[PDB]
Design an enzyme around this catalytic site. Structure first.
Site, PDB file in Angstrom:
ATOM      1  N   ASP A  26      27.104   2.395 -16.125  1.00 23.55           N
ATOM      2  CA  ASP A  26      28.343   2.674 -15.367  1.00 23.55           C
ATOM      3  C   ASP A  26      29.344   3.471 -16.189  1.00 23.55           C
ATOM      4  O   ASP A  26      29.472   3.242 -17.407  1.00 23.55           O
ATOM      5  CB  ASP A  26      29.041   1.372 -14.963  1.00 23.55           C
ATOM      6  CG  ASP A  26      28.287   0.600 -13.874  1.00 23.55           C
ATOM      7  OD1 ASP A  26      27.266   1.112 -13.289  1.00 23.55           O
ATOM      8  OD2 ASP A  26      28.725  -0.549 -13.627  1.00 23.55           O
ATOM      9  N   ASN A  78       5.903  -1.814   3.439  1.00 18.12           N
ATOM     10  CA  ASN A  78       4.991  -1.391   4.516  1.00 18.12           C
ATOM     11  C   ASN A  78       5.706  -1.432   5.880  1.00 18.12           C
ATOM     12  O   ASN A  78       5.251  -0.794   6.829  1.00 18.12           O
ATOM     13  CB  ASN A  78       3.680  -2.229   4.503  1.00 18.12           C
ATOM     14  CG  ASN A  78       2.594  -1.660   3.566  1.00 18.12           C
ATOM     15  OD1 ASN A  78       2.636  -0.482   3.151  1.00 18.12           O
ATOM     16  ND2 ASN A  78       1.586  -2.502   3.243  1.00 18.12           N
ATOM     17  N   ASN A 108      27.012  -0.991  -9.693  1.00 18.17           N
ATOM     18  CA  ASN A 108      26.496  -0.383  -8.463  1.00 18.17           C
ATOM     19  C   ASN A 108      24.953  -0.463  -8.366  1.00 18.17           C
ATOM     20  O   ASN A 108      24.345   0.217  -7.542  1.00 18.17           O
ATOM     21  CB  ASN A 108      27.006   1.047  -8.332  1.00 18.17           C
ATOM     22  CG  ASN A 108      26.494   1.936  -9.449  1.00 18.17           C
ATOM     23  OD1 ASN A 108      25.917   1.452 -10.419  1.00 18.17           O
ATOM     24  ND2 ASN A 108      26.682   3.231  -9.309  1.00 18.17           N
ATOM     25  N   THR A 135       0.806  -1.223   0.000  1.00 16.93           N
ATOM     26  CA  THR A 135       0.000   0.000   0.000  1.00 16.93           C
ATOM     27  C   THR A 135       0.858   1.301   0.000  1.00 16.93           C
ATOM     28  O   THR A 135       0.767   2.141  -0.923  1.00 16.93           O
ATOM     29  CB  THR A 135      -1.064  -0.049   1.128  1.00 16.93           C
ATOM     30  OG1 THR A 135      -2.154  -0.912   0.718  1.00 16.93           O
ATOM     31  CG2 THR A 135      -1.634   1.317   1.348  1.00 16.93           C
TER      32      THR A 135
HETATM   33 CA   LIG Z   1      25.291   1.909 -12.593  1.00 16.12          CA
HETATM   34 CL   LIG Z   2       6.847  -5.082   3.381  1.00 17.09          CL
HETATM   35 ZN   LIG Z   3      -3.754  -4.766   2.070  1.00 15.94          ZN
END
Ligand SMILES: [Ca+2]
Ligand SMILES: [Cl-]
Ligand SMILES: [Zn+2]
Ligand SMILES: *[C@@H]1O[C@H](CO)[C@@H](O[C@@H]2O[C@H](CO)[C@@H](O[C@@H]3O[C@H](CO[C@H]4O[C@H](CO[C@H]5O[C@H](CO)[C@@H](O)[C@H](O)[C@@H]5O)[C@@H](O)[C@H](O[C@H]5O[C@H](CO)[C@@H](O)[C@H](O)[C@@H]5O[C@H]5O[C@H](CO)[C@@H](O)[C@H](O)[C@@H]5O)[C@@H]4O)[C@@H](O)[C@H](O[C@H]4O[C@H](CO)[C@@H](O)[C@H](O)[C@@H]4O[C@H]4O[C@H](CO)[C@@H](O)[C@H](O)[C@@H]4O)[C@@H]3O)[C@H](O)[C@H]2NC(C)=O)[C@H](O)[C@H]1NC(C)=O
Ligand SMILES: CC(=O)N1CCC(c2ccc3ncn(CC(=O)N(C)Cc4ccc(Cl)c(OC(F)(F)F)c4)c(=O)c3c2)CC1
Ligand SMILES: [K+]
Ligand code: NA
Length: 804
Positions: A690, A181, A684, A160
């Site tokens: 890169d 979350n 990275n 959410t």
């Molecule tokens: Ca990169």
């Molecule tokens: Cl989570």
């Molecule tokens: Zn939910």
């Protein structure tokens, strides 16, 4: 923090400016903070007499204790019940009126621009639009009169808070910071949780959300956040009251949020019989807003966006995989559990904690295992889930319909009580959600293709005349949603022009330790090909533009064209077309170990065979496949040292099956394909190309850098009755970004024939052209007959391989 709840909400109910320091608050978040003034409930949360006018209330004498009003003065006061005009003035509900095109905004005097209302619904699965259609007449009218997609793709994880804040910023969760979350920041030693106060701290929330973008540019904004205990009828009444503020005080953007149908979906599953009533109730709330807009004469002025955050899948307690069934050392770890897993060490002070041994103990241990472990940098690039210190190095992708947990006692603290959940891979059908756009700026009765929620911020900025903050949308890719377009994208300028080298070196100048067994009028034909005579066949959409400073060469051949990097010693891109009729051949016996110097390119800017001999881990492959040569003589071109790239033997199994079997299958199925393939370097894991000083691995003893991934972009005609190389209309594309790995541990069936696992791997690593652009600094499709907005939509397409 101490609050003097002693003050009053008189004349302050749902005030727009949030107050401190120890002073009490009257805004729509005071309940969350437990800081409302003592009289907030009495003054601001009135409920007397409910939410509807009835015949006998009509023209009543005003009573300020009522929830809403049916007195004659109410429209002027801006506080009638939303059905006032229907009950008391013989008007019709908005839902009962015929659809009529909104060609121009029809707004009251003093409105400088059409307002935007975002109506966000938690857990609103895409198929509810068809499956619940009999009980959602208001939502179905928005959907069929406005602009709609069959579905909208959320971001990963399909939770959410990551998705609502992506809607607001146009950013991937790795960039906005809300990566689940629940989260632990190691530089905070703080957790962030759904319930609690830590999430109130602004330090978690990065990027620039739409309300800040608006305020910075002089457009006023309603509060997007709502306290859970403010009922829906009162949220709607508050938005309608704000819309009656004086011109100088009135916001131009608003959000309504509903906790349903998510809340019931967790309890009853996505299609439990108990789900009909929550759907009816959201439809009624939509009905209230539209009736209220119609009273205020704004129903043909405001743009409304009906949008979900994610769907809902069937998930029960007995479908839980337990880490205690795999690891002995289970108490040396911390797991974030559920529809995804994230694993870190229990103790910073523990020096015998080994991520490598944890992954190995989780890899292909049970025949039908319902999760798969990944180091985060090895996750499919399409998820964009790695570049943040709040994302743990170890990740588990969980199968749809399943949960992961540390030990049984975590689940059966034993009865169940949950039947639905979400959070899975964002390509999963049950995770898709909804988009409807309705109003004067949206198109009339229009269906658009599915698209990703990261694109909406730019469009909401266009709807309000704002310049978007830098984000992950591709601005112009959703122009086709809009009747009037504020934004006309232009192609990025090419930064490096290529060289076009001719024959410049004699064979004996090369000392690369390579060998090949390769010793009239046909002579003129050879030179023509080398100068670009077939280039219109193999480069169908222009050469890609290089958007950074570098040194590179264009190389032409009978069967393929390439852009060859003098810095990385390999092609940045290789482009070739395979018609429906093309023949596959083998690499002849005497050419098995053939590599040939390229007399257009200096020994100093070439790879060498000795490095590959010495490097016992590293082998090599070719970008243009020798299997698809047009003739035995053109096949020698495929063995040029300038067509060679480094590959682990385990990866060459994948690559050779793609080049030998799949490219031809796709040409057969799609009536020709054009292929562009190349290397990617993202050491990275930031999703961006890169620079040379970021490369962590080279072919032993050399300056030949080792790619982290290999891409291919596969294009053909959307009308498959036309061959790829003679196509008059829209294009069709699929792409991938395969991780260049020294083992095939990701594929549990890799001991079988490639025909049983390779294509499955490729499908998992499906990508958008735009994903490949970020990772390479190239810009594709520069020369087509199509409009640029259309090309932008094509570049954002993802082929998902889900059923229907
Ligand atoms: Ca990169
Ligand atoms: Cl989570
Ligand atoms: Zn939910
Ligand atoms: C998806 O889209 C996004 C958005 O466009 C892309 O992400 C952007 O990518 C840029 C390149 O990687 C990156 O530029 C960096 O940023 C450094 C400064 O960053 C801070 O300031 C930002 C600007 O804020 C202002 O404007 C915004 C409006 O947008 C307002 O919101 C603000 O209020 C300000 O007015 C700010 O956005 C940024 O936010 C991040 O960090 C916050 C605090 O930690 C977090 O709350 C927030 O969530 C952001 O966190 C993400 O980004 C960081 C990386 O910045 C990352 O670590 C996290 O994991 C997370 O993902 C900051 O507060 C700037 O200093 C950089 O310049 C250095 O590097 C380059 C060379 O590489 C040089 O040009 C430069 O001279 C300098 O070098 C020096 O520093 C080196 C490294 O420290 C050092 O080694 C060296 O020796 C030198 O001393 C550079 O410009 C953007 O910050 C980033 N923006 C966001 C929002 O993420 C993203 O790439 C896209 N994804 C894809 C796949 O395309
Ligand atoms: C960052 C900041 O300013 N902060 C930090 C967070 C603070 C804070 C304080 C109290 C709170 N009380 C309840 N809720 C629940 C809620 O409002 N939900 C679920 C709806 C919602 C959540 C996110 C978006 Cl983006 C959204 O907008 C939408 F729907 F359009 F996406 C709609 C909160 O999230 C919340 C947050 C406010 C100040
Ligand atoms: K080798
Ligand atoms: Na394997």
């Amino acid at each position: 923090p101490w609050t003097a709840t002693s003050g009053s909400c008189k004349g302050r109910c749902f005030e727009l400016q949030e107050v401190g320091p120890p002073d009490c608050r009257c805004d729509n978040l005071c309940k969350s903070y437990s800081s409302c003034c003592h009289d907030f409930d009495e003054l601001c949360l009135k409920t007397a007499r409910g939410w509807e006018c009835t015949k006998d209330r009509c023209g009543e004498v005003r009573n300020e204790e009522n929830a809403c009003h049916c007195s004659e003065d109410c429209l002027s006061r801006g506080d009638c019940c939303t059905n006032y005009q229907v009950v008391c003035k013989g008007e019709s509900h908005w839902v009962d009126d015929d659809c009529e095109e909104i060609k121009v905004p029809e707004c009251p005097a003093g409105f400088v621009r059409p307002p935007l209302i975002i109506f966000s619904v938690d857990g609103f699965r895409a198929s509810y639009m068809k499956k619940g259609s009999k009980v959602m007449p208001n939502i179905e009218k928005l959907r069929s009169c406005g602009t709609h997609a069959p579905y909208m793709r959320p971001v990963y994880p399909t939770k959410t808070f990551p998705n609502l804040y992506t809607l607001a910023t146009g950013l991937y969760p790795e960039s906005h910071g809300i990566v689940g979350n629940s989260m632990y920041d190691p530089v905070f030693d703080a957790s962030f949780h759904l319930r609690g106060r830590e999430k109130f701290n602004h330090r978690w929330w990065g990027g620039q959300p739409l309300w800040i973008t608006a305020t910075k540019q002089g457009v006023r904004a309603g509060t997007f956040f709502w306290s859970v205990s403010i009922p829906h009828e009162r949220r709607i009444l508050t938005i309608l009251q704000w819309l009656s503020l004086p011109d100088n005080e009135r916001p131009s953007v608003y959000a309504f949020y509903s906790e349903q149908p998510d809340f019931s979906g967790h309890k009853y599953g996505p299609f439990g019989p108990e789900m009909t009533n929550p759907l009816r109730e959201i439809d009624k709330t939509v009905g209230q807003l539209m009736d209220g807009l119609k009273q205020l004469r704004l129903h043909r002025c405001v743009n409304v966006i009906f949008v979900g955050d994610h769907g809902m899948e069937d998930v029960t307690c007995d479908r839980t995989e337990f880490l205690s069934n795999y690891l002995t050392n289970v108490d040396d770890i911390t797991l974030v559990p559920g529809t995804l897993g994230r694993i870190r060490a229990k103790s910073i002070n523990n020096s015998k904690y080994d991520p490598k041994t944890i992954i190995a103990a989780l890899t292909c241990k049970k025949p039908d295992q319902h999760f798969k472990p990944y180091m985060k940098q090895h996750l499919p690039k399409r998820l964009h889930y790695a570049n943040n210190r709040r994302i743990e190095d170890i990740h588990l992708l969980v199968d749809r319909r399943w949960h992961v947990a540390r030990k049984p006692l975590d689940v059966y603290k034993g009865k169940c009580f949950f039947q639905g959940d979400h959070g899975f891979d964002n390509k999963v059908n049950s995770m898709q959600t909804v988009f409807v756009g309705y109003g004067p700026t949206f198109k009339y009765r229009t269906k658009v293709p599915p698209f990703e929620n990261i694109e909406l911020y730019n469009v909401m900025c266009d709807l309000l005349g704002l310049k978007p903050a830098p984000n992950n949308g591709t601005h112009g890719s959703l122009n086709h949603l809009l009747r009037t377009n504020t934004f006309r994208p232009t192609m990025p300028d090419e930064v490096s022009r290529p060289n076009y080298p001719g024959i410049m070196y004699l064979q004996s100048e090369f000392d690369l330790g390579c060998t090949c067994d390769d010793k009239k009028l046909e002579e003129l034909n050879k030179r023509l090909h080398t100068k670009g005579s077939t280039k219109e066949r193999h480069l169908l959409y222009g050469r890609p533009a290089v958007l950074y400073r570098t040194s590179y060469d264009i190389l032409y051949h009978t069967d393929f064209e390439s852009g060859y990097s003098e810095i990385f010693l390999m092609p940045l891109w290789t482009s070739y077309t395979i018609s429906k009729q093309a023949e596959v051949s083998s690499i002849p016996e005497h050419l098995t170990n053939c590599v040939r110097p390229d007399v257009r390119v200096s020994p100093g800017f070439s790879q060498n065979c000795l490095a590959y001999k010495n490097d016992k881990q590293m082998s090599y492959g070719f970008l243009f496949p020798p299997y698809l040569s047009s003739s035995p003589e053109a096949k020698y071109d495929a063995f040029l040292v300038t067509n060679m790239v480094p590959m682990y033997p385990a990866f060459k199994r994948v690559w050779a099956y793609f080049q030998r079997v799949l490219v031809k299958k796709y040409a057969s199925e799609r009536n020709g394909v054009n292929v562009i393939s190349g290397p990617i370097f993202d050491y990275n894991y930031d999703g961006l190309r890169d620079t040379e000083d970021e490369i962590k691995q080279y072919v032993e003893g050399s300056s030949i850098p080792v790619p982290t991934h290999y891409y291919s972009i596969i294009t053909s005609c959307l009308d498959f009755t036309q061959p790829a190389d003679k196509c008059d209309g829209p294009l069709s594309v699929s792409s991938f970004i395969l991780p260049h790995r020294p083992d095939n541990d990701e594929s549990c069936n890799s001991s079988e024939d490639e025909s049983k696992w390779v294509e499955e791997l490729m499908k998992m690593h499906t990508a958008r052209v735009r994903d490949i652009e970020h990772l390479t600094g190239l810009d594709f499709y520069r020369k087509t007959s199509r409009s640029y907005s259309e090309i932008l939509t094509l570049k954002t397409y993802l082929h998902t391989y889900e059923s229907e």
